């Protein structure tokens, strides 16, 4: 197997190519195997909406089956969707096949096994199984589950709009067509449809929220026919991008400040986990209103342990990803995220833009990128870590280096899939702003003068 395809949270890799159906078939015995090894002889399986899964996804459940596995196929749905079904049914297992947001030939897995969801060295250990032959044999049960039913359900249940609201959903032709539109408007609203149709071929704009351009559809649907909010998710419906009614983007540290006010209100003292990249601003709302701010990895998978670590009630992070444990499950779920923020705006009088604009905000430069080399992405690093001076700045160095000054604060972090370092700035003051670029500027040429700095 190509150790390439063997990611730090998930299985990633092209069809046909560096993930053939026979890879499929061993990834499936390694993932069954695992399971077994911990207890769950019971594994959930689900596939988004790419052209190859319904292919595909038949050697990952042989692979468990060929273990001794029961494997409950439910068929095709959002990743969260998956997620529920290793939380209601039988087993705490479940292997989610999918590509998210890639072109329509990548696919790949997202995994949770005996209720852990994989990542690092755990990823690996699955590859040495497939290669020292560590596998399990039995003749396993497959078991048709029809879950989404259940999952609408669930949500519709527990959540309580106040008001109607008009909405444009832009699914971008990935799985959360199946449910995101039909749910939006079971709790009371109108539903514009945008690229709500699965199609693995993406002939429209791929389905990442994360990239502005990918919201320009979005942004002008919401003002053409004067919605209240647009929502856009991803490929298999994890992460959920947010335009007011205005067509601002709210980013997803904005979002969680709106989130963090209303379940540290009903708990107080929650602990609340956020990524190196989110504004201090949340950090101060969090603390404010009595709650334990948690700052952490960037990565779904860091970001969901940190949250059984600590007991946290809510995480997110700067991609996309919000994890509701309060009245929920824990797990990462952009249509639940959208359903949660649709009950809160439901109950302000105000619009969109004006909930979102109450709360504070620093002067920030937008995501930075700069290229380097895959060979000196992270010694970069290590030497702003070993040999910058920040002066009285609180330094964090869990993910990359940022620094938090009383006034403002600055990030820069190596990208783990691309030869970028990634970086953020924002201040209170537009001096303070200049301040900290200036350091990061000085810390950076010290390391490599000729470093291609844009700020
Ligand atoms: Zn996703």
């Not at 998978?301 to 499950?329: C, D, Q």
């Not at 700045?393 to 403002?408: E, F, H, Q």
Request: net charge negative.
């Amino acid at each position: 197997l190509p150790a390439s395809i063997f990611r730090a949270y998930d299985i990633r890799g092209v069809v046909g190519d560096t993930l053939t159906a026979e890879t499929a078939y061993w990834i499936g015995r390694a993932i069954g195997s695992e399971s077994l090894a911990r207890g769950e002889p019971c594994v959930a399986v689900g596939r988004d909406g790419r052209l190859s899964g319904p292919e595909l996804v038949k050697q990952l459940i042989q692979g468990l089956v060929d273990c001794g596995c029961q494997v409950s196929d439910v068929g095709m749905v959002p990743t969260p969707v998956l997620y529920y079904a290793a939380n209601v049914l039988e087993g705490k297992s479940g292997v989610m096949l999918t590509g998210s947001h890639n072109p329509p030939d990548y696919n790949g897995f997202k995994i949770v096994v005996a209720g852990e969801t994989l990542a690092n060295e755990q990823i690996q250990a699955l590859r040495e199984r497939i290669e020292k032959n560590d596998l399990a044999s039995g003749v396993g049960s497959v078991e048709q589950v029809d879950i989404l039913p259940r999952y609408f359900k669930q949500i519709r249940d527990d959540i309580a709009m106040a008001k109607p609201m008009k909405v444009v959903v832009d699914c971008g032709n990935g799985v959360a067509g199946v449910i995101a539109p039909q749910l939006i408007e079971a709790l009371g609203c109108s539903v514009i449809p945008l690229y709500c149709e699965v199609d693995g071929n993406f002939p429209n704009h791929h389905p990442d929220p994360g990239k502005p351009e990918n919201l320009k559809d979005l942004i002008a649907k919401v003002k053409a026919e004067n919605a209240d909010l647009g929502l856009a998710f991803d490929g298999d419906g994890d992460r959920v991008g947010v335009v007011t009614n205005t067509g601002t983007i709210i980013y997803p540290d904005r979002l969680l400040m709106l989130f963090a006010k209303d379940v540290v209100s009903r708990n107080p003292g929650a602990d609340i986990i956020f990524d190196v990249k989110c504004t201090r601003r949340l950090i101060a709302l969090i603390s404010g209103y009595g709650g334990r701010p948690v700052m952490w990895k960037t990565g779904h998978s860091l970001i969901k342990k940190k949250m059984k670590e600590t007991g946290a009630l809510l995480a997110g992070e700067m991609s996309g990803h919000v994890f509701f444990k309060e009245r929920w499950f824990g797990f990462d779920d952009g249509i639940y995220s959208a359903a949660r923020l649709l009950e809160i705006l439901s109950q302000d009088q105000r619009d969109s833009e004006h909930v979102f604009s109450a709360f504070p905000s620093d002067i920030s430069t937008p995501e930075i990128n700069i290229t380097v080399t895959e060979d000196s992405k992270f010694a970069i690093i290590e030497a702003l870590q070993r040999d910058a001076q920040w002066g009285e700045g609180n330094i964090t160095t869990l993910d990359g280096v940022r620094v938090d000054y009383p006034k403002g604060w600055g990030l820069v972090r190596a990208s783990n899939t691309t030869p970028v370092l990634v970086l953020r700035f924002e201040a209170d003051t537009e001096e303070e702003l200049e301040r900290i670029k200036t350091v990061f500027r000085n810390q950076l040429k010290a390391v490599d003068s000729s470093l291609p700095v844009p700020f």
